Amino acid sequence: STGSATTTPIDSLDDAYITPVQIGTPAQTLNLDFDTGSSDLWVFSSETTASEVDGQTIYTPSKSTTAKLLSGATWSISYGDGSSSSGDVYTDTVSVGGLTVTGQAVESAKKVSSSFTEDSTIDGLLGLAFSTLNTVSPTQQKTFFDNAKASLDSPVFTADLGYHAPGTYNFGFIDTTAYTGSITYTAVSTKQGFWEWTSTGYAVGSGTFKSTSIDGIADTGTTLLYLPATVVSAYWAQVSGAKSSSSVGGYVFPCSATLPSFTFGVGSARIVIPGDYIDFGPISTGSSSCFGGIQSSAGIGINIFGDVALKAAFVVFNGATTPTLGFASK
């Protein structure tokens, strides 16, 4: 089997991407944030504290003929941005882009933090990291990908995120029309539960390539590119008037600037992020200070190839016995 779903930016800045997902019988369609950096499929639901829901579509298990309470199971997760959610668990039929899993753990939120409530466009998350990070207790649950894997034509999914445009998540096949040149594959460590790999270096604009190992994760659920402070200073030094602002919480630059590209290595291959991808616009409405899309990882504990980086590539998440990542230009 295979599945193919379109993913759409939630706003003009590509702050996140939503993908429609069918849950239950009859289908309830919810728009989920596909997140290669976490392992829980959780939704706004009929169980979510009413004051914490503001415009999201909810999953109602009592209206699904295929919903079953997973008796005694609870979940609770905290993300890298300080957001959180928790609740109980149903099993139900989940379909993405025509690919169906029966008996998927659907984590029903009883509580969500303010950042989820305030984003009316995201009805929940669909985790695509390794199932060892799933938070369900006392019986850990499998991701949608892990449940679908055995049925797929090939044990892969691909992320093809758009710049200010829709893109695609594919399951079970590699669309050879969706990229240019060849896909370069690189080793993955699953030791931390993430799609963790080692970039071979970087360049700023038309500058020389610096060969250096940068360990990091491929994370569709993180907006920006978070790299070591050395690398991030070298980038922003090439932008007149750019600076790190403790008050704003990262590098800002004059909105009048033209940003240079940023290149990252995948083995002997190179992925170029155009300068326009690194512009996240005014820090506040009407400001002439703009927020940068490359930021320091120094306060995180890991480097994160988030959407700024991933949307410059066609990315293969190879879930074979020995997982690997693939990158192509497009």
Swiss-Prot record:
The keyword Hydrolase applies. The active site is at D35, S199. Its EC number is 3.4.23.22. Residues 17-328 form the Peptidase A1 domain. Disulfide bonds join C255-C290. It comes from the Eukaryota. Keywords: Aspartyl protease, Disulfide bond, Hydrolase, Protease, Signal, Zymogen. Coiled coil: none annotated. GO terms for molecular function: aspartic-type endopeptidase activity. It catalyses: Hydrolysis of proteins with specificity similar to that of pepsin A, prefers hydrophobic residues at P1 and P1', but does not cleave 14-Ala-|-Leu-15 in the B chain of insulin or Z-Glu-Tyr. Clots milk. One of its GO terms (biological process) is proteolysis. Belongs to the peptidase A1 family. This is Endothiapepsin. It comes from Cryphonectria parasitica. The chain holds residues 90 to 419 of 419 of the full protein.
